[PDB]
């Protein structure tokens, strides 16, 4: 439910205020370790999948942004990432903070997205291969290709 920390934050005492100023929170104080053999794309995809399928259906932003984060992370895992996904994820996690949603499930959901975007950006950047393709041609209408 909390967000990731790198090896440089291992020296911090596990308190509330001490991890509060490190852009993080203590939470349940039961730590979880991630190794180099595990890609954080799959790990954060699984975390967002758990949060998307274990949220309720009450309020809009969590309801229709956690599946969107799930699908974006699935595209990044499968190598089909597209331009407009990393900025979409960071705008999503900016708009899913405390006060914006009805309860606090969504800030704890998007905090791992915050830390994975902030620290291990290169994996998500390498997850984007194909260009942007949201619409397909009608072959009777000239597309509005902006340059």
């Amino acid at each position: 439910g909390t967000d990731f920390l790198t090896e440089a934050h291992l020296d911090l005492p596990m308190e509330f205020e001490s991890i509060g100023k490190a852009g993080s929170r203590l939470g349940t104080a039961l730590a979880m370790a991630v190794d180099h053999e595990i890609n954080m794309v799959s790990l954060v995809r699984n975390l967002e999948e758990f949060f998307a399928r274990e949220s309720c259906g009450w309020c809009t932003p969590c309801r229709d942004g956690l599946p969107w984060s799930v699908k974006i992370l699935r595209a990044l895992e499968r190598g089909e990432g597209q331009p407009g996904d990393i900025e979409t994820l960071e705008q999503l996690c900016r708009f899913l903070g405390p006060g914006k949603t009805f309860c606090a499930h969504a800030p704890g959901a998007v905090e791992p997205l915050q830390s994975a975007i902030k620290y291990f950006r290169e994996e998500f950047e390498a997850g984007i291969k194909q260009p942007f393709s949201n619409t397909h041609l009608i072959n009777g209408i000239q597309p509005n290709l902006l340059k």
């Binding site: 949201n134 619409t135 041609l137 009608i138 209408i141 509005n144 902006l146």
Partner: protein, 574 residues
Amino acid sequence: EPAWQTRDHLDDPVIGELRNRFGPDAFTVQATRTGVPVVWIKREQLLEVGDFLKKLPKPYVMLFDLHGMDERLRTHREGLPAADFSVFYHLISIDRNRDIMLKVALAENDLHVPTFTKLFPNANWYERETWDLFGITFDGHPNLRRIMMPQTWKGHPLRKDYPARATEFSPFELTKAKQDLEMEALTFKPEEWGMFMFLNLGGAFRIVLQLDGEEIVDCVPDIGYHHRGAEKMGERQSWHSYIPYTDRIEYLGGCVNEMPYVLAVEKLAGITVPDRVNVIRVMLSELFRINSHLLYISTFIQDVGAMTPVFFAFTDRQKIYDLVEAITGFRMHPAWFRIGGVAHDLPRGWDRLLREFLDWMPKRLASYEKAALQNTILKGRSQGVAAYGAKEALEWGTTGAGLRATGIDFDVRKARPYSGYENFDFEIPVGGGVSDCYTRVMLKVEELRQSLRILEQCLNNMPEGPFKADHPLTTPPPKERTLQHIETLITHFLQVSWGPVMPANESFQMIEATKGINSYYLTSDGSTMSYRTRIRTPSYAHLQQIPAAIRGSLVSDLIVYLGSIDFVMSDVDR
């Protein structure tokens, strides 16, 4: 800061001069998107405000527009004086290269304004049109009568309570009006018209002629015979559905006619169109300007030579009509300028058509100059009679080739650029001294050359961006995203059906038309339609000044002057 930002123009030197002259009070500055400082004036001091404006160090020597406005149903009147009616006076200072708006407030029970014709002589027909469309009376105004509607009219058309539909066509009214037309020549009353022998000499319009033998003494033309009611239907159609009605103002212009309405609607919405949209707009406008200039030069050169005056012009107009048919739908009225862009994209063959057009016209221009220089009999005949210069073209309107023929270097495309005309290098040609009947056609030939150079520059480096802006108020949205995105379908569904909901402001777009300076002044009440559409047309001011130059001329001189003036009667009557 964008050009569509709602400014108040409090830093304009004219506002500071008004504050120093008439105090901080006595006028109310309105913040609008017109790009023009608008000040609200009480009824009593309008004459002295204008008189102070007349002898400024760089004075406002031109009355661009004068029309009324029904404010009784305007709900979004914030920061405005409590007025049931308002008479706006659009003034332009060429020396300042600026313009101001003077809105005299009015109540319902007393629709009396002191007249403005003593200061600007072109105010006569504007005040008559205000008395026609609205119910505003002007005190001390000579021959105040109905000018656009027939004299046997009950109500006022542009007033908000007037129903804007054709009534049940009773043949009794038709027979009665035919009977009035029967005895109007024999039982003529020269007191209603504000007037020796009296006759009615039959665009198509009639002018009442008073003759001392064969010499014309007085002439008051009768207009209003082509009144389509463009402004009242502008109050009736939405923002998107008025585009064909914008085409049908003048027939030679078309795309040039829908430029100011589209740009003013974009100003109201707050849409900044990309470079490709501006270049396409410039291309189509210069194509239709070429069409109108070719028609005017062909109809001015036919009456003397008549060897090959129409066949030599027929191929050019037909090929540019085929080019317009390729770019847009049918040839005369494209209905192709949309809000925030254009209706479709240019095809994959417009480069070939434009290149085949542009390498085939220069020898036509050389032939046209040769033909305009060969007939020296017309050059010695038409150069003498009725040549106004530098003062009659500045007080009577006269925004067309007459203004630049008098030497006043004032073009909208160089003074107040619009639709990206700063990126095109073209030297505006001007006359010298008087506005002759030959200087106007020489300037139109040189304007044809400048339009050809503009088209060449457009074809040289063409942008490859979008043909529609990314604003949510671009009506309609792009078609492919409409067909395969839900949100674009939402925007298309609501903008097409109800109309694009637009913020409550006022906008004013002034462009150089194909025969003068056209302007659309649009007031939005926040609804999906237009609360007010004002169309200031150049042919109205061009036709208003013909009694000032046929004052002591002949009938053939009058016909020659009518041929040499680029007015259009349906453009006069909108």
